[PDB]
Amino acid sequence: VKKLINSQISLLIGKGLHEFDSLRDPEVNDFRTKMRQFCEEAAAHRQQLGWVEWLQYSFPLQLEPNRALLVNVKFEGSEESFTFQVSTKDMPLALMACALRKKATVFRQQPEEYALQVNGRHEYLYGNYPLCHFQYICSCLHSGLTPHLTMVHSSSILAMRDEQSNLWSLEQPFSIELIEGRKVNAMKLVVQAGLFHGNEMLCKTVSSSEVNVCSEPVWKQRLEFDISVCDLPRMARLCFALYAVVDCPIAWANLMLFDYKDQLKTGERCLYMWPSVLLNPAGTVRGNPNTESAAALVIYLPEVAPVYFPALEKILELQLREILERELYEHEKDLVWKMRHEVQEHFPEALARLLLVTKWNKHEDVAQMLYLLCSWPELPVLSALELLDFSFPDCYVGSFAIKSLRKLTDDELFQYLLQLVQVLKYESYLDCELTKFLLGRALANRKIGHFLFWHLRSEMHVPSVALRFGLIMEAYCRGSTHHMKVLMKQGEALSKLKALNDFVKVSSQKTTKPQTKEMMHMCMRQETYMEALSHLQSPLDPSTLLEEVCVEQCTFMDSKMKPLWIMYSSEEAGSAGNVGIIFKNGDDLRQDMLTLQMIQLMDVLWKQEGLDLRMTPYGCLPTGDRTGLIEVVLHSDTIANIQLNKSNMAATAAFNKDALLNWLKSKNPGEALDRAIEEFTLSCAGYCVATYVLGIGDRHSDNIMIRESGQLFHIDFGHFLGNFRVPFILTYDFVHVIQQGKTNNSEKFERFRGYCERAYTILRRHGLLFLHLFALMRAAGLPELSCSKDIQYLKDSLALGKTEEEALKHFRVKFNEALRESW
Numbered sequence: 001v002k003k004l005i006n007s008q009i010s011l012l013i014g015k016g017l018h019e020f021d022s023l024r025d026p027e028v029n030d031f032r033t034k035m036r037q038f039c040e041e042a043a044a045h046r047q048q049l050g051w052v053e054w055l056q057y058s059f060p061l062q063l064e065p066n067r068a069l070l071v072n073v074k075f076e077g078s079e080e081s082f083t084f085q086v087s088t089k090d091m092p093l094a095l096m097a098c099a100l101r102k103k104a105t106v107f108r109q110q111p112e113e114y115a116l117q118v119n120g121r122h123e124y125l126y127g128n129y130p131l132c133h134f135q136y137i138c139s140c141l142h143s144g145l146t147p148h149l150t151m152v153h154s155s156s157i158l159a160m161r162d163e164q165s166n167l168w169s170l171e172q173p174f175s176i177e178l179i180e181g182r183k184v185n186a187m188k189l190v191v192q193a194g195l196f197h198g199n200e201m202l203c204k205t206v207s208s209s210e211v212n213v214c215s216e217p218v219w220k221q222r223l224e225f226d227i228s229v230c231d232l233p234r235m236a237r238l239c240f241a242l243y244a245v246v247d248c249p250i251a252w253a254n255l256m257l258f259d260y261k262d263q264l265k266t267g268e269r270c271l272y273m274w275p276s277v278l279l280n281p282a283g284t285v286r287g288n289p290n291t292e293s294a295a296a297l298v299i300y301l302p303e304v305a306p307v308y309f310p311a312l313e314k315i316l317e318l319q320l321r322e323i324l325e326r327e328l329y330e331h332e333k334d335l336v337w338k339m340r341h342e343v344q345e346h347f348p349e350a351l352a353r354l355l356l357v358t359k360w361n362k363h364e365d366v367a368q369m370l371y372l373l374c375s376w377p378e379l380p381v382l383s384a385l386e387l388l389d390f391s392f393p394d395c396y397v398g399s400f401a402i403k404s405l406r407k408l409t410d411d412e413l414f415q416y417l418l419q420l421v422q423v424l425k426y427e428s429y430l431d432c433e434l435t436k437f438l439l440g441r442a443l444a445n446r447k448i449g450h451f452l453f454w455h456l457r458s459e460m461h462v463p464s465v466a467l468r469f470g471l472i473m474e475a476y477c478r479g480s481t482h483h484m485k486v487l488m489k490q491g492e493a494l495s496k497l498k499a500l501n502d503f504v505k506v507s508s509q510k511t512t513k514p515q516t517k518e519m520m521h522m523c524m525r526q527e528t529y530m531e532a533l534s535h536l537q538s539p540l541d542p543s544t545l546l547e548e549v550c551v552e553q554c555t556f557m558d559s560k561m562k563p564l565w566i567m568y569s570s571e572e573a574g575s576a577g578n579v580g581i582i583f584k585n586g587d588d589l590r591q592d593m594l595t596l597q598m599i600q601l602m603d604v605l606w607k608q609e610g611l612d613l614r615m616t617p618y619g620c621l622p623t624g625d626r627t628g629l630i631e632v633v634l635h636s637d638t639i640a641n642i643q644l645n646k647s648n649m650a651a652t653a654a655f656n657k658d659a660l661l662n663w664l665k666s667k668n669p670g671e672a673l674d675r676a677i678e679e680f681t682l683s684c685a686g687y688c689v690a691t692y693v694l695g696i697g698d699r700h701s702d703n704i705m706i707r708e709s710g711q712l713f714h715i716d717f718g719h720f721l722g723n724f725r726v727p728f729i730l731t732y733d734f735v736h737v738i739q740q741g742k743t744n745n746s747e748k749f750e751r752f753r754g755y756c757e758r759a760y761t762i763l764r765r766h767g768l769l770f771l772h773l774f775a776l777m778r779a780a781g782l783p784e785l786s787c788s789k790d791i792q793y794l795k796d797s798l799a800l801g802k803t804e805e806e807a808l809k810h811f812r813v814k815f816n817e818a819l820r821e822s823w
């Protein structure tokens with residue numbers, strides 16, 4: 001069995017475990033054994049959890065950030081169901097009391113023994129919360145639907161639990177010998193080397209001698225650095241660039257000067273370099289795994305004595321501030337450092353600014369900073385996120401930052417998971433506090449575990465992270481054997497969708513769409529495909545169950561990559577078991593995921609201030625190499641499709657401007673139309689503010705969709721942050737709907753401007769949260785989130801320098817400009 005598990009892990013993570021063994025690497029070997037132990041302890045703990053605690057782990061509650069209501073309740077193993085009237089303010093317990101009282105009268109005769117499952121989903125209602133605080137009930141109220149729930153007894157939950165078991169002395173200048181290279185080029189070669197602590201140089205860079213593009217180049221020269229060996233900070237990295245000149249970059253390579261056991265490195269090293277686009281301090285400190293073809297540098301680290309970095313106990317041994325403390329001059333820097341005790345004492349949240357003023361290239365000053373740091377009070381989550389930036393390379397700072405993030409709720413962690421995973425790319429060593437933090441949290445919440453897995457799995461085709469990410473996924477698997485098998489099922493479904501999508505691509509260039517679609521259906525109806533594609537948890541949302549694939553309703557779309565549109569149904573889920581996914585292969589989905597996650601965050605922040613813009617936060621999840629899934633919002637269509645203005649159709653208009661309004665009218669007869677116009681106005685405000693703030697341009701009728709409820713949302717975000725200064729967009733046909741069809745309607749239109757202003761001003765108040773998250777996202781390597789000007793785009797769009805009064809006036813001008821332009 002131990003053999004079988006290992007083969008399953010290798011298959012799941014997309015990398016053979018034997019490959020880790022073959023590295024003969026102590027750091028890898030250490031990581032694997034420590035993390036495996038940690039993860040196995042988490043699993044022991046989980047297996048004895050109380051049944052409510054188990055539910056909390058497996059099906060974490062889905063909550064929103066007086067009225068009558070009908071609810072249908074059945075018991076687990078029964079056809080018989082009952083419809084009860086309850087209040088939105090009632091607790092699930094009261095509901096469960098009704099259900100049991102009804103059961104006992106039927107059967108002729110305790111609520112705390114039960115939880116309520118949402119029919120056909122892995123989602124439960126339990127706890128001390130009014131029904132309307134549950135996302136599901138809340139959702140049912142707005143769409144107008146009846147909640148369907150199933151009474152599940154504690155013994156049944158426990159069966160699920162059960163089925164799922166498993167030094168200071170060295171004053172000589174730092175120096176290296178550059179020995180030789182092995183490489184490709186057209187000119188002379190040079191090696192530039194710098195010593196970095198994060199983004200900051202610890203001293204000047206020092207260049208190599210120019211040697212002809214001949215060879216197999218052979219330097220054999222001492223490069224000496226303008227820094228003492230005792231002043232190298234613990235997280236010092238040495239960064240190289242190999243290039244050509246008569247500039248033409250060739251390659252780069254980084255390494256930590258100390259190893260994962262804190263020992264200073266000696267002597268010779270062979271550096272397999274990464275091909276270029278000159279110094280790249282934020283680039284990985286691990287060699288290029290393509291040793292067959294990568295250019296290679298050999299250096300020698302001279303034996304300076306073995307010295308390990310000094311222990312903490314040894315480290316420990318060794319006005320107008322406010323008016324500025326809200327980029328700084330050197331004298332301003334000097335007062336901050338001078339008054340570092342006051343900073344700790346009366347301005348602890350200004351820790352980052354103090355860290356940025358310490359001289360990381362002098363060990364006495366670092367020991368000073370560290371001394372303060374070790375008694376520094378915990379900071380809020382917002383402050384802690386800033387400290388995860390690459391600007392804060394020191395391990396003690398890193399550790400402090402994680403310590404401060406431990407108070408993150410699961411809902412917050414989930415919201416910031418994408419960025420936390422991306423920060424892993426900044427890590428210097430395999431065994432680190434972030435990895436342990438993410439793994440423990442993942443093992444204590446299955447939803448965390450699910451998305452941690454997919455974020456890591458979706459980048460296994462990236463050589464620079466394959467090893468790190470592979471190792472973490474292995475560790476995770478040791479910690480939950482059952483969930484590994486659930487995840488393997490999803491991977492099997494994704495393997496099949498790829499093969500099917502490849503077929504569809506080929507067929508679409510040879511025959512008519514009707515013919516390709518029929519062939520797609522025959523392929524899907526093969527036993528191997530019916531079995532692979534049915535009965536899985538959605539990678540988009542593990543609480544959504546994808547039961548039986550409805551082949552007859554599957555198709556594909558006409559765009560370049562021919563994305564697949566896959567529908568599912570489930571008898572048990574009734575009608576909320578009718579769900580769709582899109583499989584897309586050929587495009588990088590990371591940018592779309594980021595854009596949707598930031599819009600979802602806006603929706604959270606708006607709702608926390610009592611502003612519900614009726615947004616549509618659907619899933620998007622990269623799963624592999626230019627591969628991933630998109631959640632289908634049903635009962636929606638594109639603005640362009642609605643505006644095709646076909647004859648012999650409900651929405652038949654005298655003027656194209658009336659097409660959308662007419663469409664809305666046909667889906668929302670009578671009284672209902674007014675609320676639909678309201679849903680459209682609210683969502684339109686939300687999306688107009690979001691796409692402006694994030695600089696999403698190229699918005700048109702083919703990438704804007706509308707729900708039959710009136711709710712508008714966006715699809716296919718190819719660009720953001722003004723990378724293909726985007727204006728605020730007001731579209732005429734939308735303004736026409738907002739104005740209820742009327743040419744003049746300032747009452748409705750100005751209500752809509754109010755919504756826009758209220759949404760925009762709320763985001764500004766959280767501007768720093770967006771900034772810190774985008775900062776962390778720079779680790780991802782998206783070409784549209786690659787430098788400062790990308791970030792500056794967000795600063796400008798949020799007008800963060802300005803007072804709220806100025807910001808709003810500025811916004812009002814952009815909005816008014818948008819309205820003029822509206823024809």
Ligand SMILES: FC(F)c1nc2ccccc2n1-c1nc(N2CCOCC2)nc(N2CCOCC2)n1
Binds near residue numbers: 584702714
């Ligand atoms: F290529 C398209 F699949 C596509 N790429 C997307 C990237 C991010 C988000 C959504 C994306 N979609 C997408 N997403 C969707 N969704 C996803 C949201 O629910 C409605 C259906 N539909 C489409 N199309 C249907 C109508 O006309 C154009 C294609 N396309």
